[PDB]
Enzyme design. Structure first.
Site, PDB file in Angstrom:
ATOM      1  N   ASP A 128       0.802  -0.964   0.151  1.00  0.00           N
ATOM      2  CA  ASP A 128       0.738  -0.074   0.113  1.00  0.00           C
ATOM      3  C   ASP A 128       1.170   1.633  -0.164  1.00  0.00           C
ATOM      4  O   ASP A 128       0.728   1.804   0.897  1.00  0.00           O
ATOM      5  CB  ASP A 128      -0.947  -0.550   0.747  1.00  0.00           C
ATOM      6  N   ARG A 151      -0.806   8.402   2.619  1.00  0.00           N
ATOM      7  CA  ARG A 151      -1.558   7.800   3.579  1.00  0.00           C
ATOM      8  C   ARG A 151       0.042   6.773   4.327  1.00  0.00           C
ATOM      9  O   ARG A 151      -0.361   7.064   6.355  1.00  0.00           O
ATOM     10  CB  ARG A 151      -2.587   7.152   3.926  1.00  0.00           C
ATOM     11  N   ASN A 152       0.761   6.686   4.082  1.00  0.00           N
ATOM     12  CA  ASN A 152       1.303   5.798   5.142  1.00  0.00           C
ATOM     13  C   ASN A 152       3.365   6.090   4.795  1.00  0.00           C
ATOM     14  O   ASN A 152       3.941   5.240   5.101  1.00  0.00           O
ATOM     15  CB  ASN A 152       1.347   3.932   4.333  1.00  0.00           C
ATOM     16  N   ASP A 176       6.144   0.296   7.000  1.00  0.00           N
ATOM     17  CA  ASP A 176       6.231  -0.563   6.235  1.00  0.00           C
ATOM     18  C   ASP A 176       5.277  -1.410   7.513  1.00  0.00           C
ATOM     19  O   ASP A 176       5.079  -2.655   7.296  1.00  0.00           O
ATOM     20  CB  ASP A 176       7.899  -1.098   6.615  1.00  0.00           C
TER      21      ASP A 176
END
Ligand SMILES: Cc1nc(Nc2ncc(C(=O)Nc3c(C)cccc3Cl)s2)cc(N2CCN(CCO)CC2)n1
Length: 260
Positions: free
Chosen positions: A125, A129-130, A143
């Site tokens: 993903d 946002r990450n 991660d």
């Protein structure tokens, strides 16, 4: 061993997100503390996920400190990254940034990603946002619970958590598989989010529409802040065939002349 921290040495200060809290560790270190409630995930999954995050230690990946697993809520402790979420940062302060700083954000992500690629891991993903922004505007990728082991130039089943389709490589929604380059496709979308200062990709379309339009050859337009050369780098990430997409090592060497 060394993964378990002394829970009494962590003072919880304020909620950061939803539940992640800001804390002080040993009265000296700023930490972020993720609360794992009983039933939110299996204890076996939690242990595996913590061990993997610990192992994948790199300056461009979120630094795992340890866990507090002797009672609930279970703590996952990491470094505290001051500027928060990259998506919110782009949306709030992006307008003021220099295009060279936006390119630098892409380079940071690419560096962390080339590290994961060197261990034959993909990020399932890879999106703004990450990502987290430090004091110096340096980007770090999270991660945690998002990686998958995949041998170079191979495919594995997509079975597991289903991530947003607008960041997914075609093999993911067409064939229910990940390739060692599914990661690279998402990196192009992340680059587009950075250069568009956090706009939603394929804004006017539904997930079913995107899946169809992407299959037809439709790609995201060039954000005005991105040079022609930068757009060509993001475009190269979106080849339908994983074998035709670059590696994060090749992307790193492409981004470098443009000033990192
Ligand atoms: C949501 C949020 N996160 C912030 N910092 C973080 N650092 C590390 C975090 C974290 O989640 N680590 C983690 C990961 C990544 C995986 C597994 C487990 C864990 Cl524990 S979250 C700062 C922040 N800010 C709000 C907006 N303010 C603007 C004022 O100018 C800045 C401060 N908001």
């Amino acid at each position: 061993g060394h993964m378990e921290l002394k829970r009494e040495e962590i003072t919880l200060l304020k909620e950061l997100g939803s539940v992640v809290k800001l804390g002080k560790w040993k009265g000296q270190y700023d930490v972020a503390v993720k609360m794992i409630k009983e039933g939110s995930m299996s204890e076996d999954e939690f242990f595996q996920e913590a061990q993997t995050m610990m192992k994948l230690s790199h300056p461009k990946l979120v630094k795992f400190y340890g866990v507090c697993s002797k009672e609930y809520p279970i703590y996952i402790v990491t470094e505290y990254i001051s500027n928060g979420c990259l998506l919110n940062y782009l949306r709030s302060h992006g307008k003021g940034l220099e295009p060279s700083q936006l390119l630098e954000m892409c380079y940071d992500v690419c560096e962390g990603m080339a590290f994961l690629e060197s261990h034959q891991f993909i990020h399932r993903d890879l999106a703004a946002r990450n990502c987290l922004v430090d004091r110096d505007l340096c980007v770090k990728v999270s991660d945690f619970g998002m990686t998958r082991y995949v041998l170079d130039d191979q495919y594995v089943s997509s079975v597991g958590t289903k991530f947003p389709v607008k960041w997914s490589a075609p093999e993911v929604f067409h064939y229910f598989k990940y390739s060692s380059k599914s990661d690279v496709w998402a990196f192009g979308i992340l680059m587009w989010e950075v250069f568009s200062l956090g706009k939603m990709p394929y804004d006017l379309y539904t997930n079913s529409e995107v899946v169809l339009k992407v299959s037809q050859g439709h790609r995201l337009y060039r954000p005005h802040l991105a040079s022609d050369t930068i757009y060509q780098i993001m475009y190269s990430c979106w080849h339908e065939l994983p074998e035709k997409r670059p590696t994060f090592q090749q992307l790193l060497s492409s981004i470098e002349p443009l000033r990192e």
